[PDB]
Coordinates of C-alpha atoms and ligand atoms in Angstrom, one line a residue:
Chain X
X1475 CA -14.4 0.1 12.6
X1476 CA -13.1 -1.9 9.4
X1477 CA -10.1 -0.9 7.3
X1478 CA -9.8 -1.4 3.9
X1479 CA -7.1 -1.1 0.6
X1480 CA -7.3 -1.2 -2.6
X1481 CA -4.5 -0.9 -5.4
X1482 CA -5.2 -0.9 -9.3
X1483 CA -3.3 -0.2 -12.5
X1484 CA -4.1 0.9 -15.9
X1485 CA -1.9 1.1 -19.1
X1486 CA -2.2 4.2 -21.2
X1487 CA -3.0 3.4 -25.0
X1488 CA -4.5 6.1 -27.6
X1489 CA -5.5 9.1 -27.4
X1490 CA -5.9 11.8 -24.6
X1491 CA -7.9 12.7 -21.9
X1492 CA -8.0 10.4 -19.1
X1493 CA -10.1 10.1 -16.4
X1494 CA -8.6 10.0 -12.7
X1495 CA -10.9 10.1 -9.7
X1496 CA -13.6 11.2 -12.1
X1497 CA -11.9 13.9 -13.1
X1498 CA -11.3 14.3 -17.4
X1499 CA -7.6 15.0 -17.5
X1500 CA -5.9 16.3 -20.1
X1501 CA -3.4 14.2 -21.7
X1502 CA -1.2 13.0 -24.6
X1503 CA -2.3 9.6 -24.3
X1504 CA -5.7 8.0 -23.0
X1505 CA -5.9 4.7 -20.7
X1506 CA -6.7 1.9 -21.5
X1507 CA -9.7 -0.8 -20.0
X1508 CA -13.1 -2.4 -20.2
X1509 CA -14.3 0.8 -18.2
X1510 CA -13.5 4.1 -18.0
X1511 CA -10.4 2.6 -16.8
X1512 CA -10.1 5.5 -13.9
X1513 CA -7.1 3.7 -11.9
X1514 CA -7.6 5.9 -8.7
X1515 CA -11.8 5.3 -8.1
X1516 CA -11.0 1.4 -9.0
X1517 CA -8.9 1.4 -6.4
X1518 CA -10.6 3.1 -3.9
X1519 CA -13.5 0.4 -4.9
X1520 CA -11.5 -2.4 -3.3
X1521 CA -10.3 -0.3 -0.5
X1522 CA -14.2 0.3 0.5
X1523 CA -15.5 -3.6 -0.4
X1524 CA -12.1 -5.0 1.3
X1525 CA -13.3 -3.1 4.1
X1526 CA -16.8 -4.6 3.6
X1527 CA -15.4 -8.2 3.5
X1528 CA -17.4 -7.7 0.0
X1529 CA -14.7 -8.8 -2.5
X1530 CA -13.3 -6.7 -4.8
X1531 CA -14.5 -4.7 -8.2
X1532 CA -13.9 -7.6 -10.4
X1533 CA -16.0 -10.2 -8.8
X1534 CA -19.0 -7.4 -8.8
X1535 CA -18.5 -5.7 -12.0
X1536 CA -16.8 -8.8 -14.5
X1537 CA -14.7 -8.1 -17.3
X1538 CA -16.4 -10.5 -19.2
X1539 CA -19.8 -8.5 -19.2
X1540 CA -20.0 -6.2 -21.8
X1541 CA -22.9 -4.2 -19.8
X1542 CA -19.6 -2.7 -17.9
X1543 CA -18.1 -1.6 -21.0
X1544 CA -17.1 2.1 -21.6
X1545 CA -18.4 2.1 -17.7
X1546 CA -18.3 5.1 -15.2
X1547 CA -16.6 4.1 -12.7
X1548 CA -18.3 6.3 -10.7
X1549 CA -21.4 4.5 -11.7
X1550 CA -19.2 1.4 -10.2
X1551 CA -18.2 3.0 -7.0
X1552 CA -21.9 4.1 -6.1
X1553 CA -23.2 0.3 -6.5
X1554 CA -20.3 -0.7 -4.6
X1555 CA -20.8 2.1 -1.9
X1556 CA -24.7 0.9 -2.1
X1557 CA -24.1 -2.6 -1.3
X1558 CA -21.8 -1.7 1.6
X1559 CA -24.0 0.6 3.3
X1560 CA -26.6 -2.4 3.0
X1561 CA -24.2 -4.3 4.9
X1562 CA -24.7 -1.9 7.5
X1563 CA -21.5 0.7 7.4
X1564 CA -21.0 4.3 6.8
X1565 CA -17.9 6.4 6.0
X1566 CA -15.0 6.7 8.3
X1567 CA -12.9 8.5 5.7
X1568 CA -10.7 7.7 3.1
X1569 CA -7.2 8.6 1.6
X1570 CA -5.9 7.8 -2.2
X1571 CA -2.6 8.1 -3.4
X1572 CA -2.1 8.5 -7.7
X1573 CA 1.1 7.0 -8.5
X1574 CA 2.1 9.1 -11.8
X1575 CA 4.9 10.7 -14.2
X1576 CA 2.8 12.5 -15.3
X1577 CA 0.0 14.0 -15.8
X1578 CA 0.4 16.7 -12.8
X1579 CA -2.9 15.7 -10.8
X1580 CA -2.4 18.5 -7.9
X1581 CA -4.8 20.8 -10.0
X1582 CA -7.4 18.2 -10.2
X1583 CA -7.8 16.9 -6.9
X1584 CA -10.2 19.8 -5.2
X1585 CA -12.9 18.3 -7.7
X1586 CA -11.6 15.1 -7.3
X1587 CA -12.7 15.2 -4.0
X1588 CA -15.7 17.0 -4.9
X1589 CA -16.9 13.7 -6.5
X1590 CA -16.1 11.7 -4.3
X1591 CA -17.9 12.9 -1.5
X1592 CA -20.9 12.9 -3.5
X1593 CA -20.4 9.4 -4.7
X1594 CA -19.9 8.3 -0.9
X1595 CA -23.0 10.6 0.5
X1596 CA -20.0 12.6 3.1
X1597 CA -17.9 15.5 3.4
X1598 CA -15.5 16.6 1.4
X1599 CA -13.4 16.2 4.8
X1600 CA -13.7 12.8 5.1
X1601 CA -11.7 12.2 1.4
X1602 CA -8.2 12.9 0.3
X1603 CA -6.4 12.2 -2.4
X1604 CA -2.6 12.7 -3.5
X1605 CA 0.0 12.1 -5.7
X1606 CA 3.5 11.0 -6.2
X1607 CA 5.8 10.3 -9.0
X1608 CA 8.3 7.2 -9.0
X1609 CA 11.0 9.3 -10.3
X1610 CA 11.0 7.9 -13.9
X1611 CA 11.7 4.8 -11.8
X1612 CA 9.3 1.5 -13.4
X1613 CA 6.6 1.5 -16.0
X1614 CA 5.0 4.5 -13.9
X1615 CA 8.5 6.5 -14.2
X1616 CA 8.8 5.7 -17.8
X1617 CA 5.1 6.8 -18.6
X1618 CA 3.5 3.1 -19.2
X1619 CA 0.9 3.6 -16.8
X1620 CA -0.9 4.8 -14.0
X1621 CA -0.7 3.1 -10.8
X1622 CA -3.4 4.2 -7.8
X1623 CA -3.2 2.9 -3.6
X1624 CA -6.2 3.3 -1.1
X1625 CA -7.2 2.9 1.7
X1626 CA -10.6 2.9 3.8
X1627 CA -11.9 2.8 7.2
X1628 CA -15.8 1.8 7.8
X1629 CA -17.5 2.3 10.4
Chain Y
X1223 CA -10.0 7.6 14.2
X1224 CA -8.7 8.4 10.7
X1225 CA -6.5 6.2 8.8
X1226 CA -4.0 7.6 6.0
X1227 CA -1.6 5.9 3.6
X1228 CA 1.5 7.5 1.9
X1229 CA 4.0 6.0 -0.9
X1230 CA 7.2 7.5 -2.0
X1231 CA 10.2 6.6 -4.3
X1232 CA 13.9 8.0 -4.8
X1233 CA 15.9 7.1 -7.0
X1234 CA 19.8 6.5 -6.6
X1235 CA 22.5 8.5 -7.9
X1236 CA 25.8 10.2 -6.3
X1237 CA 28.2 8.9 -3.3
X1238 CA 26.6 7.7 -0.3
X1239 CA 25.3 7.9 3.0
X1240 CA 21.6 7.7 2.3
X1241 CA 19.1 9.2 5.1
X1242 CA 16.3 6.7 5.8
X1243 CA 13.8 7.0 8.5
X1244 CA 16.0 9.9 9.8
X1245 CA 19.5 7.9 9.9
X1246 CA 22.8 8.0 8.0
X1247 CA 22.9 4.7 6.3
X1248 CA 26.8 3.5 5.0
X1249 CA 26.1 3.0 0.9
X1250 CA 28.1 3.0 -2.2
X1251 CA 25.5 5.0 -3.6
X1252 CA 23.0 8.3 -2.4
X1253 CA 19.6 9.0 -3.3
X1254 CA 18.6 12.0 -6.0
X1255 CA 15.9 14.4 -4.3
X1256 CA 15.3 17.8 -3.8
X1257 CA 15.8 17.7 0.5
X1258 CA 17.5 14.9 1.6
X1259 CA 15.6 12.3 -0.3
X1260 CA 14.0 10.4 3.0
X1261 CA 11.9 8.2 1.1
X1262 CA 10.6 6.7 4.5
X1263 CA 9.5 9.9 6.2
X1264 CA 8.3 11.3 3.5
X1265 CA 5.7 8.7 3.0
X1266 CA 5.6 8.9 6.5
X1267 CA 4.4 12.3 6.4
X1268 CA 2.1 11.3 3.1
X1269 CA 0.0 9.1 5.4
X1270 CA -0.2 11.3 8.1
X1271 CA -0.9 14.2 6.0
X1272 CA -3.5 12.2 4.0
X1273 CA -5.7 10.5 7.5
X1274 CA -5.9 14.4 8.3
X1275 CA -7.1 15.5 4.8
X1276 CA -4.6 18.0 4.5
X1277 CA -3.3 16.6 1.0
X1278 CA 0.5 15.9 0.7
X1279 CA 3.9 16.8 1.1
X1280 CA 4.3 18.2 -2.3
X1281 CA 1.1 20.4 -2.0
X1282 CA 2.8 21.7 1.8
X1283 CA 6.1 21.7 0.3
X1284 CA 6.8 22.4 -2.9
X1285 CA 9.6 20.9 -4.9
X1286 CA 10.1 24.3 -7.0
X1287 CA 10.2 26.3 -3.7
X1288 CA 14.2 26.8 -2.7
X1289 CA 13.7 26.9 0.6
X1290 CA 13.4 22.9 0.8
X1291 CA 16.3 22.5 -0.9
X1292 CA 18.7 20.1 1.2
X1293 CA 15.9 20.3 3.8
X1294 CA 15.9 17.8 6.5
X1295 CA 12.8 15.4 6.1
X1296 CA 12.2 15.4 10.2
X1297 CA 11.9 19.0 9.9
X1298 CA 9.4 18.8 7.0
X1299 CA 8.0 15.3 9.3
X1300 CA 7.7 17.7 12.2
X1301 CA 5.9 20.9 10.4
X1302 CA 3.3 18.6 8.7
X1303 CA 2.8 16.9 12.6
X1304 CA 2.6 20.4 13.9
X1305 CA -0.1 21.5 11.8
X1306 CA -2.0 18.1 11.9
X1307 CA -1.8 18.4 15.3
X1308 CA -3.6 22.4 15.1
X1309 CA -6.3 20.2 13.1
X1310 CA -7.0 18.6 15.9
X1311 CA -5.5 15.1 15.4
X1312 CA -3.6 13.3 17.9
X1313 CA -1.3 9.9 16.8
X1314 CA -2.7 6.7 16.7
X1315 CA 0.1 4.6 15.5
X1316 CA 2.1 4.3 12.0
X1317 CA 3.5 1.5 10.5
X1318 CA 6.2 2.0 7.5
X1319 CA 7.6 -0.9 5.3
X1320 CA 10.6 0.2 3.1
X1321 CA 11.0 -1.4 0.1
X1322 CA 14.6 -1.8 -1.1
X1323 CA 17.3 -4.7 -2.4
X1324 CA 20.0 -3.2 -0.4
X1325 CA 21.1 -1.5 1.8
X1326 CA 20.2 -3.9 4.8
X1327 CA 17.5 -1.3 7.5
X1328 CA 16.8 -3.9 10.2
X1329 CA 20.0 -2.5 12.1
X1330 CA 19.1 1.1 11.7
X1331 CA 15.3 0.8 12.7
X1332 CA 15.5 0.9 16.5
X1333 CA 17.4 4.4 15.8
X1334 CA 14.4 5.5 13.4
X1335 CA 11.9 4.4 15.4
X1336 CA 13.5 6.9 18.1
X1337 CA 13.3 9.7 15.8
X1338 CA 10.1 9.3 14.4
X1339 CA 8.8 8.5 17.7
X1340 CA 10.2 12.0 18.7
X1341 CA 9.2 13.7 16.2
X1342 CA 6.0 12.7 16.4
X1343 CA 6.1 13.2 20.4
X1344 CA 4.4 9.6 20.6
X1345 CA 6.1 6.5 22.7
X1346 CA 8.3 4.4 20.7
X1347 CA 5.4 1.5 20.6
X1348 CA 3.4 4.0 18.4
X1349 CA 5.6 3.7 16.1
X1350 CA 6.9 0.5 13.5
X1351 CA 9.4 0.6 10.6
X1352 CA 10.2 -2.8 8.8
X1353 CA 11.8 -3.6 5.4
X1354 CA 11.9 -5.9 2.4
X1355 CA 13.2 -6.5 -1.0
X1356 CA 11.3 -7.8 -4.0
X1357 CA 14.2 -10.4 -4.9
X1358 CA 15.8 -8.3 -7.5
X1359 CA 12.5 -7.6 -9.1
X1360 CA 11.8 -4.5 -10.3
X1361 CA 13.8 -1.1 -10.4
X1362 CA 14.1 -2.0 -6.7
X1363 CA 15.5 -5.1 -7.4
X1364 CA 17.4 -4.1 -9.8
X1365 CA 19.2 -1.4 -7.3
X1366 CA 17.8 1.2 -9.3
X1367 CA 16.1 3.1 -6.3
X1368 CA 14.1 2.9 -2.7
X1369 CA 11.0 2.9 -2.7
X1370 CA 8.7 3.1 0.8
X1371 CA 4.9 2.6 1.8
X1372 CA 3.1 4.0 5.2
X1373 CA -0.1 3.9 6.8
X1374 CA -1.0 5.8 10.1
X1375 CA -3.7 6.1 12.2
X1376 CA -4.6 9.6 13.7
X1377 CA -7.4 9.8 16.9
Chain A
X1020 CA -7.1 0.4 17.6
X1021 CA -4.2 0.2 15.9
X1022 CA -3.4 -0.3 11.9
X1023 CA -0.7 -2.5 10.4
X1024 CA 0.6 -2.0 6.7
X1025 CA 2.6 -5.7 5.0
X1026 CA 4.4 -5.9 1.2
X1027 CA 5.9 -9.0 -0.2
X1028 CA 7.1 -10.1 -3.7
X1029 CA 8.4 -13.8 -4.7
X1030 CA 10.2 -14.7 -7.9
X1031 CA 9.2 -17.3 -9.8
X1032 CA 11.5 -20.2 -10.5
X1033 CA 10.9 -24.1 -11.2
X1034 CA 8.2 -26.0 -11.6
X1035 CA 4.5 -25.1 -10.1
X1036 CA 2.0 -25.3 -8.2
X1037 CA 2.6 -22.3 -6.0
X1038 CA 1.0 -21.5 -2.2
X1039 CA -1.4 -18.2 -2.2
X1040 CA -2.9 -17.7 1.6
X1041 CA -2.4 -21.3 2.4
X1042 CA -4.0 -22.2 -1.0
X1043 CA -1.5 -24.9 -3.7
X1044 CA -2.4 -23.2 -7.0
X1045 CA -1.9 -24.7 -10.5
X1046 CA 0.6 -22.9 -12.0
X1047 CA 3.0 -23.6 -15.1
X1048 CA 6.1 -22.1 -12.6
X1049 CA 6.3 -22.0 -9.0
X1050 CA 7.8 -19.7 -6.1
X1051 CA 11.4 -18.7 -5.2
X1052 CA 11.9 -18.1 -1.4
X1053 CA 13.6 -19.4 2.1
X1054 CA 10.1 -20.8 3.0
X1055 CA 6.9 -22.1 0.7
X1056 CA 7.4 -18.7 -0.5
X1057 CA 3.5 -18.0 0.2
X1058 CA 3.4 -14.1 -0.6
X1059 CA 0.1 -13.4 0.5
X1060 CA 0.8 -14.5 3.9
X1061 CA 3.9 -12.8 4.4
X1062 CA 2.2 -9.8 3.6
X1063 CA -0.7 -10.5 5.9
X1064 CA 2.1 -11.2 8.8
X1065 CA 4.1 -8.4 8.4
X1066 CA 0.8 -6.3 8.6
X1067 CA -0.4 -7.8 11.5
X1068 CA 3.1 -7.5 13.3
X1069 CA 3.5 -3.9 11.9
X1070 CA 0.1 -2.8 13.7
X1071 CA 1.2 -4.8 17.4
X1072 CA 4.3 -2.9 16.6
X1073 CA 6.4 -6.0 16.7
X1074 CA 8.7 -5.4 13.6
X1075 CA 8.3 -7.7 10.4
X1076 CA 8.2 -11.4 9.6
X1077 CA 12.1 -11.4 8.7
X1078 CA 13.4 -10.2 12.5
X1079 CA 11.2 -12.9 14.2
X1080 CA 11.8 -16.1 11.2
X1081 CA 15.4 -15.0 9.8
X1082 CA 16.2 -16.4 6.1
X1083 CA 19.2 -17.5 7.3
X1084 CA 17.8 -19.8 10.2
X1085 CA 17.6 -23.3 8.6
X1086 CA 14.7 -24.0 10.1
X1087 CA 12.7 -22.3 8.1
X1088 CA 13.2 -23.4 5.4
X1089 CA 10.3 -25.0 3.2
X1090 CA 8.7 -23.6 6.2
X1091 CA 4.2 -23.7 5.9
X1092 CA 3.8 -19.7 5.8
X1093 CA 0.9 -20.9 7.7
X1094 CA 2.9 -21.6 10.6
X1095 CA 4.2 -18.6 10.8
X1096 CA 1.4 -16.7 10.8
X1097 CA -0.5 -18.7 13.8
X1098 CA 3.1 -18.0 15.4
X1099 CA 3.2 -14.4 14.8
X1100 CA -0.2 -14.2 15.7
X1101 CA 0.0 -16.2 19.2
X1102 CA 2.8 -13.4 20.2
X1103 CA 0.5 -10.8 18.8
X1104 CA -1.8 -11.7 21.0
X1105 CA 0.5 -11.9 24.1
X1106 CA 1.1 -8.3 23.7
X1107 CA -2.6 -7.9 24.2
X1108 CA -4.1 -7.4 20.8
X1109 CA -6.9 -9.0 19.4
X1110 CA -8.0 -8.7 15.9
X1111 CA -10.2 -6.1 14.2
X1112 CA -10.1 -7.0 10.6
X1113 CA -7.5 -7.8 7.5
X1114 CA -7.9 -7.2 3.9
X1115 CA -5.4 -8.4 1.5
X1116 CA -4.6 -7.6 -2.5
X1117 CA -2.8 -10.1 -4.7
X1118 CA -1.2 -8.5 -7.4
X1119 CA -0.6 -10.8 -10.0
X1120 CA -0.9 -11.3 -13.5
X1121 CA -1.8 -14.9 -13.0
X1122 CA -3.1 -17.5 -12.2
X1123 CA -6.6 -16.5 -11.7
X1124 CA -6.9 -15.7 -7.7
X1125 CA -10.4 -15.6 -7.6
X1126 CA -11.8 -19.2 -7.4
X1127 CA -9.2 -19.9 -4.6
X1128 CA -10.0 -16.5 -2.5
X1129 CA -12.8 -18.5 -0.5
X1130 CA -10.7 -21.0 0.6
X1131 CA -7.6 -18.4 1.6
X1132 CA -10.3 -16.9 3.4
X1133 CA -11.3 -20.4 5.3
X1134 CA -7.2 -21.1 6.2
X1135 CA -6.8 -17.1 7.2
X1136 CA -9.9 -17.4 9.1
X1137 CA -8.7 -20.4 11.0
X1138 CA -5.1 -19.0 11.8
X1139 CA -6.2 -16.1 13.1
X1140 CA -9.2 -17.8 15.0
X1141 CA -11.8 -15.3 13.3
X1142 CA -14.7 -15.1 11.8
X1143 CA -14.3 -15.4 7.7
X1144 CA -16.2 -11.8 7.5
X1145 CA -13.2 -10.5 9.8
X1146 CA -10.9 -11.3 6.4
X1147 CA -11.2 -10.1 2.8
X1148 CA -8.8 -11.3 0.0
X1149 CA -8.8 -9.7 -3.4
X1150 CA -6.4 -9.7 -6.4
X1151 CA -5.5 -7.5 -9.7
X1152 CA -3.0 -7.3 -12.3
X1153 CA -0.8 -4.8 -13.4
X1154 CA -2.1 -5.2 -17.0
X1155 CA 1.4 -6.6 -18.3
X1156 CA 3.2 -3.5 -16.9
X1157 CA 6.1 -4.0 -14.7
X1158 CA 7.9 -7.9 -13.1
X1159 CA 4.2 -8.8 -12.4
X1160 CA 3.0 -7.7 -15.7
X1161 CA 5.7 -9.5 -17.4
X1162 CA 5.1 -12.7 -14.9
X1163 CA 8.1 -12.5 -13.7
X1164 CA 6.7 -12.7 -9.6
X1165 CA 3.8 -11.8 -7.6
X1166 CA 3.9 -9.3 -5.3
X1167 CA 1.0 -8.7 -2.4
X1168 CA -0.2 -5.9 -0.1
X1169 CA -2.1 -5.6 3.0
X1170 CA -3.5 -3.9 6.1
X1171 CA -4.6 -5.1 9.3
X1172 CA -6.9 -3.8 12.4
X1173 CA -6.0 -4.6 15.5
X1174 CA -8.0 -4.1 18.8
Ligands
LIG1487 N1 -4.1 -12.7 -10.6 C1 -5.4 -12.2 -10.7 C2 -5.6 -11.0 -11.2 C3 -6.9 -10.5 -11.2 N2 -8.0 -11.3 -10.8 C4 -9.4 -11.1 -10.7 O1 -9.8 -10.2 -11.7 C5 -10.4 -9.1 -11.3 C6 -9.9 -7.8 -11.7 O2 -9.0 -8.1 -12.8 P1 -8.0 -6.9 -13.4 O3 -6.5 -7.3 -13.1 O4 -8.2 -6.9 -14.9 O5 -8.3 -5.4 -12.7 C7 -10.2 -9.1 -9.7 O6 -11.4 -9.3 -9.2 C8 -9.3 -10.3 -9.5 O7 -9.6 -11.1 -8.4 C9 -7.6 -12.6 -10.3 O8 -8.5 -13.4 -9.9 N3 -6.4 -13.0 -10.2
LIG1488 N1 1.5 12.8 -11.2 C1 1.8 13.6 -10.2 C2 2.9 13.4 -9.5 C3 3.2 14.2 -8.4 N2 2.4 15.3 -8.2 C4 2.5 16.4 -7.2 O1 3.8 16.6 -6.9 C5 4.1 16.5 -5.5 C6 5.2 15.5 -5.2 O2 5.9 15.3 -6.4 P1 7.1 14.1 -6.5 O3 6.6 13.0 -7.4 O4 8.4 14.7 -7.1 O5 7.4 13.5 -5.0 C7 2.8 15.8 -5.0 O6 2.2 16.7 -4.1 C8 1.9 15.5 -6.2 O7 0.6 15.8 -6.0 C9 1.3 15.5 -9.0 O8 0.5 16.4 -8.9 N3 1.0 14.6 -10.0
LIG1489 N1 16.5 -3.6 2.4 C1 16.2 -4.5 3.3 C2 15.4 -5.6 2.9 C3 15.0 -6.6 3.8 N2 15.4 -6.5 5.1 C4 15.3 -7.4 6.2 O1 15.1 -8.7 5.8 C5 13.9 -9.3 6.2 C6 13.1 -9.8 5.1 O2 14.0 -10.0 3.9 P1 13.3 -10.4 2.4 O3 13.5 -9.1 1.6 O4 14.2 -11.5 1.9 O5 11.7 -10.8 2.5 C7 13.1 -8.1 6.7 O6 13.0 -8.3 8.0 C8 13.9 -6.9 6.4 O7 13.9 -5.9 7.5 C9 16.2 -5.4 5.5 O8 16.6 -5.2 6.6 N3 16.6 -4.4 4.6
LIG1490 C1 -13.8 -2.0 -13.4 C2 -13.8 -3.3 -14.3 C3 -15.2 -3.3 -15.1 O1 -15.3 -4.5 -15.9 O2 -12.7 -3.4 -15.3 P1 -11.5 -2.5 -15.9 O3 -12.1 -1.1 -16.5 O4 -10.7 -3.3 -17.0 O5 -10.3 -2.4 -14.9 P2 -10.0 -3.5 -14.0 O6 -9.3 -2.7 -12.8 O7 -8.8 -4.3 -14.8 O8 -11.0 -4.6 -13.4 C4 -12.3 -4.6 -12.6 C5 -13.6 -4.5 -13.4 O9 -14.6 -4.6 -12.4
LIG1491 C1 10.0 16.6 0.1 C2 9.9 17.5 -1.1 C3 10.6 18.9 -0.7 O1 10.5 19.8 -1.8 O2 10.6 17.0 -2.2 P1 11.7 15.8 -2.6 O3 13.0 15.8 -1.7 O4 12.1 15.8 -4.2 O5 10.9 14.4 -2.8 P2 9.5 14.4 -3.3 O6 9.1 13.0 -2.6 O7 9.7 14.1 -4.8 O8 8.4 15.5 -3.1 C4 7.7 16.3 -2.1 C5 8.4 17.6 -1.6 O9 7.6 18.2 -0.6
LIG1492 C1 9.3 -16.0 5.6 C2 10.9 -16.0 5.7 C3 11.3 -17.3 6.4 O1 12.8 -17.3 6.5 O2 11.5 -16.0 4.3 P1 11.1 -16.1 2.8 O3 10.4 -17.5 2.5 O4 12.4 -16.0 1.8 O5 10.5 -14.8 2.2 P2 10.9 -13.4 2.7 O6 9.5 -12.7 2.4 O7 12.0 -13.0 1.7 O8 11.4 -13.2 4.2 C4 11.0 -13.3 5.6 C5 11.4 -14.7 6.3 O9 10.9 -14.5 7.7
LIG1493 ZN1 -8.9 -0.7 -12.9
LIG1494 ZN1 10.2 11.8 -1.5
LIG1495 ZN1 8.0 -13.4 1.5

């Protein structure tokens, strides 16, 4: 058994909806990145290639390379999840935590999850997501971005 | 073996004691929440919650329902251990690192550690709390709040 | 098994390079703290001593003892590690995030990895290093420190 984490931010910038653990979320204002820029699937990513002793999503999937532009980063967490079961491990489980002001992500999680699971080949049992504000404490608290934790366990 | 990870923050506000990791804790100022604002056993229970896929402490409960109001976060600690427990779980271990300026925890873990440790009917060697501050960085450096990361392992 | 969460955050003040998991990395400014200051390695301790349930890297090398001072973070960890080890553990795995705007952590990761490796008296697949910025949002987005996470394994 490996264990893995992850942790990734993303700061929001034009329009509305944004996309969280796949997940299109309504929203005032959008996120921005090179991808998708879903903070919470980024950093489950790293939690599941830390695990690996695979790197992390940046060294796979550069900024620099324009064919990652606009990405899915479901798309990302797939490859990522490919390569890692090539390396030999399956799916212990995994836990995210959303660290947001707002939007309310509660609602969103069940298909979240649903995802997820598919993206990792398990059961919806072995993923769980959840979600915290910073009471209007930091640029999270004042609405400047989204913050996302993870962490995996390999097997 | 499931692994979970939790993250909380509370900001400060009124007179003092505050109530971390179960214990009263001398301070000029209090913490703003809607029980007693543990940030520590709430992520606590976040992490423990989230390696048994049973979502979080918001989604058990809720910060609308009056019945939490004032609530005592080991009661809330205990509940979510209860029905992790009915799940099927048993502890692993948990490790908690609270994040804050001031006021000094090292003297006051011992003391937490025997409350969690009770609470979560495990030996006191299951169970680690530790601290740090991110030299008056942030709105935890700037006193503004505590803020409190966990990761547990269930069996 | 048991699992073992660190934090750390360093200010930085004077003039470069600064020390990232044993690596001296160029750097216009350089790290506040009692020791080198190496935040990466702090963070990797205080996980490690977290999981042996052993407390954190302040109770066992206090800021206040002198003798830590400029202290190789290095050193610290091979110590924390030999009394991990007298408690019986032995290690599973570590993975470690770098949150920091810059300097690039990437080009230097192999070589934390080499040092880690060695303190720990692993294999370099039993240790995973990857970093990530808070996209200018917050005292790492505005450079004012670096803060670090990480999770550790032990058997
Ligand atoms: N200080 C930093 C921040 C990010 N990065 C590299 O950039 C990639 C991701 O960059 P982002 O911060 O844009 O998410 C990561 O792979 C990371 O290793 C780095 O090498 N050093
Ligand atoms: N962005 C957020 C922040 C919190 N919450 C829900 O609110 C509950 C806890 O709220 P607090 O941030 O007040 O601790 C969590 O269960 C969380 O899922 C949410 O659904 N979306
Ligand atoms: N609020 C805090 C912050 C740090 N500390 C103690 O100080 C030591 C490390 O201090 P630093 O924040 O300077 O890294 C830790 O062992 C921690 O327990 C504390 O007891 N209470
Ligand atoms: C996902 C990738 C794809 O280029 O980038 P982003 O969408 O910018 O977000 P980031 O978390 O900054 O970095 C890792 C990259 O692999
Ligand atoms: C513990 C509960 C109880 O209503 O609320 P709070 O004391 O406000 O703190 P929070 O961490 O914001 O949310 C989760 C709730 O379950
Ligand atoms: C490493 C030690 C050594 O005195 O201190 P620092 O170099 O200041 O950094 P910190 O992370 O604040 O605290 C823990 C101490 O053990
Ligand atoms: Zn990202
Ligand atoms: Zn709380
Ligand atoms: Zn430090």
């Amino acid at each position: 058994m490996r264990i893995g984490h992850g942790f990734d931010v993303h700061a929001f910038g034009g329009e509305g909806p944004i996309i969280i653990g796949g997940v299109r979320i309504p929203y005032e204002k959008g996120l921005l990145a090179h991808s998708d820029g879903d903070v919470a699937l980024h950093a489950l990513t790293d939690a599941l290639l830390g695990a690996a002793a695979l790197g992390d999503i940046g060294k796979l999937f550069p900024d620099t390379d324009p064919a990652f532009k606009g990405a899915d980063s479901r798309e990302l967490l797939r490859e990522a999840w490919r390569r890692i079961q090539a390396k030999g491990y399956t799916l212990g489980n995994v836990d995210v935590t959303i660290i947001a002001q707002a939007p309310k992500m509660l609602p969103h999680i069940p298909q979240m999850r649903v995802f997820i699971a598919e993206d990792l080949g398990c059961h919806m049992d072995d993923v769980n997501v959840k979600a915290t504000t910073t009471e209007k404490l930091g640029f999270t608290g004042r609405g400047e971005g989204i913050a996302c934790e993870a962490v995996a366990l390999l097997i």
